[PDB]
């Protein structure tokens with residue numbers, strides 16, 4: 029029901045349209061089944077002959093056009109996201125069958141959390157601070173466009189062949205579906221999200237990086253995180269996290285949202301901490317965090 033969509037959404041999608049002849053979706057090759065949204069390996073033909081590797085996001089399909097319109101908006105939101113540290117949109121493919129297809133450049137190393145969790149990987153303090161800095165650069169760009177992420181976490185950050193981090197997003201009044209453990213105090217209490225609350229999320233993301241992907245607050249039930257935080261608590265300093273990086277995390281977790289550093293200041297501060305390291309310090313996984321979900 030393409031005509032019942034929205035003429036402005038349809039014209040915006042038209043400028044990023046992919047013809048069904050120039051895209052081959054390998055439905056047998058799944059890049060994570062996820063939930064009610066699937067990602068597959070894809071081949072895209074660019075201009076002439078070019079056989080580029082891509083990720084194709086789908087699913088499919090209950091409400092008349094409501095979920096299709098939201099799906100197309102999420103993809104169209106990426107149009108002006110051109111920054112080395114933010115995931116790009118190759119385009120959108122309109123299937124003459126069912127669900128429209130969102131086409132993204134392939135990220136060889138997948139998500140940042142599974143990458144750092146992998147025990148065959150040997151990151152140093154510098155590499156992990158490096159990833160945090162790249163996320164800060166991407167967020168600095170997004171904040172300058174007044175774009176509020178709402179779900180910044182290592183699981184939503186993508187890693188390519190050159191190890192360049194691409195900030196991305198994989199995918200109800202009082203009902204729970206929210207990433208409460210990455211959420212700012214004000215966002216848990218009121219349900220409002222700002223750049224300052226993304227700064228809180230970024231601090232948790234730095235914690236995930238320094239612990240090599242440990243789940244935040246393991247002992248704490250999702251429903252009582254506000255009660256836990258208000259007792260006067262923050263995540264402990266990871267074993268391999270340098271003191272000035274911990275101090276930056278505590279600044280991201282400032283109880284006054286307006287007292288939190290901006291992403292521009294975080295880029296500056298983290299870039300200085302990063303420059304002091306040479307790649308000597310190896311980061312090992314914590315035994316108390318292994319197999320902890």
Ligand SMILES: Nc1cc(Oc2ccc(Nc3ncccc3C(=O)Nc3ccc(F)cc3F)cc2F)ccn1
Nearest residue numbers: 067083085102103115130133134135138195196197198
């Ligand atoms: N192996 C691999 C796996 C991949 O999976 C995906 C990861 C993220 C998205 N993300 C999206 N899918 C559809 C619409 C928008 C986004 C998205 O990330 N938007 C977005 C970008 C930057 C932001 F700050 C916020 C956002 F919401 C899609 C994938 F297929 C992809 C590649 N390589």
